[PDB]
Design a protein around this motif. Structure first.
Motif, PDB file in Angstrom:
ATOM      1  N   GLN A 227      -8.148   7.062  -2.210  1.00  0.00           N
ATOM      2  CA  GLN A 227      -7.319   7.053  -3.404  1.00  0.00           C
ATOM      3  C   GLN A 227      -5.941   6.451  -3.157  1.00  0.00           C
ATOM      4  O   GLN A 227      -5.028   6.662  -3.959  1.00  0.00           O
ATOM      5  N   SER A 228      -5.769   5.726  -2.057  1.00  0.00           N
ATOM      6  CA  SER A 228      -4.498   5.075  -1.782  1.00  0.00           C
ATOM      7  C   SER A 228      -4.244   3.960  -2.784  1.00  0.00           C
ATOM      8  O   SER A 228      -5.170   3.301  -3.263  1.00  0.00           O
TER       9      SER A 228
ATOM     10  N   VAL B 128      -3.126   0.412  -3.924  1.00  0.00           N
ATOM     11  CA  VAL B 128      -3.084  -0.921  -3.342  1.00  0.00           C
ATOM     12  C   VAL B 128      -2.590  -1.898  -4.395  1.00  0.00           C
ATOM     13  O   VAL B 128      -2.873  -1.739  -5.587  1.00  0.00           O
TER      14      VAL B 128
ATOM     15  N   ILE C 294      -6.735   1.277  -6.793  1.00  0.00           N
ATOM     16  CA  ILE C 294      -6.854   2.190  -5.674  1.00  0.00           C
ATOM     17  C   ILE C 294      -7.564   1.466  -4.540  1.00  0.00           C
ATOM     18  O   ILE C 294      -8.180   0.414  -4.727  1.00  0.00           O
ATOM     19  N   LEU C 295      -7.469   2.039  -3.338  1.00  0.00           N
ATOM     20  CA  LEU C 295      -8.048   1.406  -2.158  1.00  0.00           C
ATOM     21  C   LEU C 295      -9.564   1.321  -2.246  1.00  0.00           C
ATOM     22  O   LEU C 295     -10.168   0.394  -1.697  1.00  0.00           O
TER      23      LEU C 295
ATOM     24  N   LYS D 134      -5.627  11.359   0.589  1.00  0.00           N
ATOM     25  CA  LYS D 134      -7.001  10.882   0.597  1.00  0.00           C
ATOM     26  C   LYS D 134      -6.975   9.363   0.690  1.00  0.00           C
ATOM     27  O   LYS D 134      -6.370   8.697  -0.156  1.00  0.00           O
ATOM     28  N   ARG D 135      -7.621   8.820   1.724  1.00  0.00           N
ATOM     29  CA  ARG D 135      -7.504   7.393   2.013  1.00  0.00           C
ATOM     30  C   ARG D 135      -8.147   6.549   0.924  1.00  0.00           C
ATOM     31  O   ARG D 135      -7.683   5.444   0.627  1.00  0.00           O
TER      32      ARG D 135
ATOM     33  N   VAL E 104       0.841  -1.191   0.000  1.00  0.00           N
ATOM     34  CA  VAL E 104       0.000   0.000   0.000  1.00  0.00           C
ATOM     35  C   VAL E 104       0.878   1.243   0.000  1.00  0.00           C
ATOM     36  O   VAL E 104       1.902   1.300   0.687  1.00  0.00           O
ATOM     37  N   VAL E 105       0.489   2.222  -0.807  1.00  0.00           N
ATOM     38  CA  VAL E 105       0.990   3.587  -0.725  1.00  0.00           C
ATOM     39  C   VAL E 105      -0.165   4.441  -0.233  1.00  0.00           C
ATOM     40  O   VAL E 105      -1.189   4.566  -0.918  1.00  0.00           O
ATOM     41  N   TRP E 106      -0.015   5.009   0.958  1.00  0.00           N
ATOM     42  CA  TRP E 106      -1.098   5.749   1.594  1.00  0.00           C
ATOM     43  C   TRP E 106      -1.076   7.182   1.089  1.00  0.00           C
ATOM     44  O   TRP E 106      -0.264   7.997   1.526  1.00  0.00           O
ATOM     45  N   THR E 107      -1.969   7.492   0.160  1.00  0.00           N
ATOM     46  CA  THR E 107      -2.133   8.865  -0.278  1.00  0.00           C
ATOM     47  C   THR E 107      -2.814   9.684   0.815  1.00  0.00           C
ATOM     48  O   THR E 107      -3.285   9.151   1.823  1.00  0.00           O
TER      49      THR E 107
END
Ligand SMILES: [Mg+2]
Ligand SMILES: [Mg+2]
Ligand SMILES: [Mg+2]
Ligand SMILES: [Mg+2]
Ligand SMILES: [Mg+2]
Ligand SMILES: [Mg+2]
Ligand SMILES: [Mg+2]
Ligand SMILES: [Mg+2]
Ligand SMILES: [Mg+2]
Ligand SMILES: [Mg+2]
Ligand SMILES: [Mg+2]
Ligand SMILES: [Mg+2]
Ligand SMILES: [Mg+2]
Ligand SMILES: [Mg+2]
Ligand SMILES: [Mg+2]
Ligand SMILES: [Mg+2]
Ligand SMILES: [Mg+2]
Ligand SMILES: [Mg+2]
Ligand SMILES: [Mg+2]
Ligand SMILES: [Mg+2]
Ligand SMILES: [Mg+2]
Ligand SMILES: [Mg+2]
Ligand SMILES: [Mg+2]
Ligand SMILES: [Mg+2]
Ligand SMILES: [Mg+2]
Ligand SMILES: [Mg+2]
Ligand SMILES: [Mg+2]
Ligand SMILES: [Mg+2]
Ligand SMILES: [Mg+2]
Ligand SMILES: [Mg+2]
Ligand SMILES: [Mg+2]
Ligand SMILES: [Mg+2]
Lengths: 236, 130, 157, 96
Positions: free
Chosen positions: A204-205, A207, A219-220, A201-202, A196-199
């Motif tokens: 739009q992270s 995954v 995206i998440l 805005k959660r 995961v890259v945590w953007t």
RNA sequence: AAACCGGUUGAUCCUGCCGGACCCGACCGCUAUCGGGGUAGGGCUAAGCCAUGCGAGUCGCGCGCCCGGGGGCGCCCGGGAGCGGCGCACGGCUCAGUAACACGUGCCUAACCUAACCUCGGGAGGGGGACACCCCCGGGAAACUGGGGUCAAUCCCCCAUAGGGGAAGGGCGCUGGAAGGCCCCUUCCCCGAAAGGGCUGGCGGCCGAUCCGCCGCCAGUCGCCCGAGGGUGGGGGCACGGCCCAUCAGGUAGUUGGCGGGUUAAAGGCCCGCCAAGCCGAAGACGGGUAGGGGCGGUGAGAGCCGCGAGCCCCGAGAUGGGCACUGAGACAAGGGCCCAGGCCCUACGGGGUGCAGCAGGCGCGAAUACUCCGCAAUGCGGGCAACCGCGACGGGGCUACCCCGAGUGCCGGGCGAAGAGCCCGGCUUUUGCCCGGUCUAAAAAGCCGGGAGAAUAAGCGGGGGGCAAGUCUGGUGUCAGCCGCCGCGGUAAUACCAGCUCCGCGAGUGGUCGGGGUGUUUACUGGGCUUAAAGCGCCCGUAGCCGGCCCGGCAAGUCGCUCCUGAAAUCCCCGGGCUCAA
């Protein structure tokens, strides 16, 4: 309200040129218009039980079709992700599961599984009496006490008993669980949530799911946890 | 209401000061507004419930006699009587014509009070003692 | 604002300068050899040939990796149609194809070459009047491009 | 366009050529402008009469201007009273 | 096929323009047999005027009444005029306005509303009223409409509670990137729900054939009200992108901003009171002109150019011009309302109706155009529990040289003819055309299968001096008549005009004029030129802009690579499959 066939969603299993200029418009029900298929379309183009809209509407109006444990007599009822469809006079039970090729397909499921629905939590609200209303991916709601509502977070999954109106189990969004992509391009892929890259805005992270060496990214917002290494409900 | 006489739509003037043509000939009903409905200081309270956009309702104080005056120095609410309007800082014409608006100063039986409510939109005069 | 309408498919075969004596002579020779109705049929055959040749040129211009999943199926389809005789020839040999190979695949031409008709015009008359059966069904279009597998299933009434 | 024929006129061909090309003066219905329209074909002028409705059409030539040896004529007659002058000249139709 | 050809000279090399050859779109001429596929047809012309017909209904499982048949339990069946609910703001048309947050792409509303539908939690208690149809009377030419009587409701209203809003104070808690939001507590003010209604079956009771109901309970079922979320539709905001002109250089004064308010569902000079002088502009304001935007379309080998950017889909605007409102979730409403203007129709002169840019149809304009046809069977929608009903949407055919596809107008041998056309002779075939049956079709028509006679029913348009394929053959005329996109013929011996014969190109098409592209390296990014052919301002200073030395360190904006969310569908390219192939 009308639905021009050109404006019908592109994933719908209908011809784009041969036919009339109209398509059956879903009737604002328990899904999204662009991520759901009307019941008449399911009966006529997905199961081929009815040859015309008249025959499909007859079959629906008799009450032969059941969606998520409730008989649906409206031919425009939306059918969407993870919904359980049950045919009464035949006994056949399908789940609307994500598909690589048709994007959304009716896959037969066991009768023991037919009473469960895996619903992705989409949000939480505070309601009267201090209770917590969970909002799921298909618009369904569940009011719970604050202590149980505190530990359930957004993007979690819950296996929910349709017949009891209860939460059979809760699957939190953690790294390493099994997840399925329920949306865009990489649809239907099942794999291990391993990156995961945590953007900021959660939703739009970024995954990444893995199936051995098969790595896909989304995206998440576009993934749903269906449990650990074995999915809880038959999706394939 | 939604009246074309009180249209709240866009101007025909650009930021450069020049004019621009009308994209739409008719006035949208959604962009219409209504006349002022602020209360007038009177001998009894008269309230009127009005239907608005989407079927909702708005309570209008067509005439106001009593004010819900709050004393924070006593932490108490008293339903006082409005003797007069001392000033309307938004526009002196309101006080001159005995109209009550938000921010208006009113001489009620407890003393001077500032109107902390929108009397044309809320239908009541909530006030705070000074 | 534009509405799409169908266009002529023989434009790619039709020449832009019709009034060349050499071009007229060769076209007249081909027309008389194969018994074609008009110049439109010959230009349609040339358009088919131009499509095949330009497909070969495009696949040659693509890289080896891109060409790999398309080169073998392309030659296989040409062989199955009957335009190319060896499906494993190099791609650049496809560039040297001739319109006579396409003209040989006409149903009237095949009916004449199998000896079922006294002449090519009689073969056209047979196909028009419906005495030519292709695997049991009447194919009444003389310009039909018969494939290799269907070539041996041609009969007379 | 359409026009009403007013008079029959004859223009002189340009210097190296010797001929009197026979045209008419036509007043256009839509604008009212009067313009000289060449009447082609041998004996074509004899099928044209005064006050006859005619179809006026561009004479051809480079860039829509005058033709080869006719000076300053940009139009020619294609129809006479609803019948094509070519058909009338060839005998396929009769002028109404 | 990434193409050249003719023309300025006594001749030659250039420049450079004009023409030829190709495709597409519009109109037009001559001619025209069949079939298939397709979202072709008053757009390119007046958003010019209109006779006539049709073009939004549905629900008796919301409600009472009346009529007719049937039967005894508590009614069954059918019909009528209505009230009432829901829909008619979707669907259909057209292109005046608009150079604009209109449109497209990418994001927002933490600044908002939303009937119908979905889910979760909760609620449905008391009471009252009126108006239709109808009956008795009408009035009016018609439109329309008055009085009395009388039965109802899921019709209308009050009461209670739930709930809701405003002001203020506090908080663990929730969402979310972030609380002016949600929940909890506290205070006052204010507003303020509901249809347990319909049906089914069961139970019990009241009641009466002058009744065929009413009431209490249960279950099923369709419903009603509140809170929260979703769904759908809608309102609003933002960044960026896409025309011409300087023979348009200064424009703006609610104009630009702030503060306080009103209005709104909601932010905003949206509007208002006060305060300041601000805002736009040569990176082109302002002014004028043109135009609905996009998907997309034509053309070219391509870059590119063009809009045929008409038809098909999405968004916008409008309903004779200009305004303003009612109802409603939603309109300031094309087949609803009111007013001015400007027309028109009916009249019994007192009044009433009406504007086809809906589907046919008429007039007008123009170079330029379809049936006052058939069906709700397919595709959908509104209504209904349903069955079903309706729909000029849609579907089907008609007409029309709309675009693409496939075919015919015979084949074989012999003779005459010239090897040609054509004629004759002998044989073959029946696509096609004509007649019949089945199938098909909502029904038709057509298509397909099959059957009958039969060579029998079916080719034109343009051209022959060069460009440019095809006649120095014949007659006529004699710088006249005529040809001629350009070059050029014709003034007695015309391959160029008028005719015959004959040949050439394409062919159910072939030509004329227009507009676009090619042509064109004559707009030049790829890719032109400026000594003399058109073209260096008479010279210089310099603003914006564009272009800019070397090395080292940081960034990672441009740039490059991969990936994700996207860029509607159709359209376009490739592949596989199905229509006899084809389209
Ligand atoms: Mg000239
Ligand atoms: Mg010379
Ligand atoms: Mg028009
Ligand atoms: Mg009901
Ligand atoms: Mg009735
Ligand atoms: Mg509409
Ligand atoms: Mg009600
Ligand atoms: Mg609240
Ligand atoms: Mg109440
Ligand atoms: Mg009641
Ligand atoms: Mg405000
Ligand atoms: Mg303003
Ligand atoms: Mg070129
Ligand atoms: Mg149309
Ligand atoms: Mg108006
Ligand atoms: Mg109106
Ligand atoms: Mg009109
Ligand atoms: Mg019409
Ligand atoms: Mg139907
Ligand atoms: Mg054809
Ligand atoms: Mg001979
Ligand atoms: Mg038939
Ligand atoms: Mg001819
Ligand atoms: Mg001749
Ligand atoms: Mg020649
Ligand atoms: Mg000539
Ligand atoms: Mg040059
Ligand atoms: Mg010079
Ligand atoms: Mg100089
Ligand atoms: Mg000068
Ligand atoms: Mg000088
Ligand atoms: Mg970068």
């Amino acid at each position: 309200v009308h639905l021009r066939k050109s404006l019908a969603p592109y994933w719908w299993p209908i011809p784009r040129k041969a036919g009339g200029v109209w398509a059956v418009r879903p009737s604002t029900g328990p899904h999204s218009l662009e991520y759901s298929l009307p019941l008449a379309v399911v009966v006529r183009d997905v199961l081929r039980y009815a040859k015309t809209l008249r025959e499909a509407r007859y079959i629906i109006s008799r009450g032969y079709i059941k969606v998520d444990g409730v008989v649906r007599k409206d031919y425009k009822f939306p059918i969407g992700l993870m919904d359980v469809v049950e045919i009464v006079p035949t006994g056949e039970i399908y789940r609307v599961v994500p598909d690589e090729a048709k994007y959304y397909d009716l896959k037969p499921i066991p009768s023991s599984e037919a009473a469960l629905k895996p619903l992705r939590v989409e949000g939480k609200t505070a309601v009267s009496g201090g209770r917590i209303q969970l909002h799921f991916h298909d618009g369904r709601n569940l009011i719970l006490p604050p202590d149980v509502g505190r530990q359930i977070k957004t993007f979690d999954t819950v296996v929910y008993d349709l017949e009891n109106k209860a939460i059979k189990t809760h699957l939190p969004l953690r790294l390493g669980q099994l997840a399925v992509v329920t949306h865009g391009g990489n649809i239907g892929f099942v794999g291990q949530f391993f990156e995961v890259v945590w953007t900021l805005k959660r939703r739009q992270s970024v995954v990444a799911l893995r199936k051995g060496e098969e790595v896909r990214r989304t995206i998440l917002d576009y993934i749903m946890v269906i449990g650990t290494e074995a999915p809880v409900v038959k999706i394939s | 209401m939604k009246l074309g006489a009180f249209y709240k739509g866009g101007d025909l003037v650009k930021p450069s000061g020049g004019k621009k043509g009308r994209v739409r000939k008719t006035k949208k009903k959604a962009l219409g507004g209504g006349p002022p409905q602020i209360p007038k200081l009177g001998e009894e309270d008269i309230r009127y419930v009005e239907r608005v956009r989407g079927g909702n309702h708005k309570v209008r104080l067509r005439q106001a006699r009593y004010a819900n005056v709050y004393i924070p120095k006593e932490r108490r609410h008293v339903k006082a009587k409005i003797l007069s309007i001392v000033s309307s800082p938004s526009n002196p014409d309101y006080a001159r014509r005995n109209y009550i608006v938000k921010g208006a100063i009113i001489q009620t039986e407890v003393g001077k009070a500032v109107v902390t409510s929108r009397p044309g939109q809320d239908g009541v005069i909530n006030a705070v003692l000074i | 604002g534009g509405l799409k309408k169908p266009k002529k498919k023989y434009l790619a075969g039709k020449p832009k300068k019709i009034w060349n004596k050499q071009l007229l002579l060769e076209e007249l020779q081909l027309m008389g050899e194969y018994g074609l109705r008009n110049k439109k049929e010959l230009w349609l055959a040339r358009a088919r040939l131009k499509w095949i040749v330009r497909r070969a040129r495009a696949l040659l211009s693509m890289t080896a990796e891109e060409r790999a999943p398309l080169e073998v199926p392309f030659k296989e389809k040409l062989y199955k149609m009957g335009f190319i005789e060896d499906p494993n020839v190099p791609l650049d040999r496809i560039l040297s194809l001739d319109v006579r190979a396409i003209l040989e695949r006409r149903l009237q031409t095949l009916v004449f070459r199998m000896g079922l008709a006294k002449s090519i015009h009689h073969a056209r008359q047979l196909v028009v009047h419906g005495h030519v059966l292709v695997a049991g069904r009447r194919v009444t279009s003389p310009g039909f491009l018969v494939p290799r597998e269907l070539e041996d299933k041609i009969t007379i009434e | 366009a359409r026009g009403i024929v007013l008079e029959k006129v004859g223009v002189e061909a340009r210097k190296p050529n010797a001929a009197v090309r026979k045209c008419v003066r036509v007043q256009l219905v839509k604008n009212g402008k009067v313009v000289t329209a060449f009447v082609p074909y041998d004996g074509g002028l004899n099928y044209i009469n005064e006050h006859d409705e005619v179809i006026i059409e561009r004479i051809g030539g480079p860039e829509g201007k005058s033709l080869g040896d006719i000076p300053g004529v940009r139009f020619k007659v294609v129809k006479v009273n609803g019948v094509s002058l070519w058909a009338i000249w060839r005998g396929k139709k009769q002028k109404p």
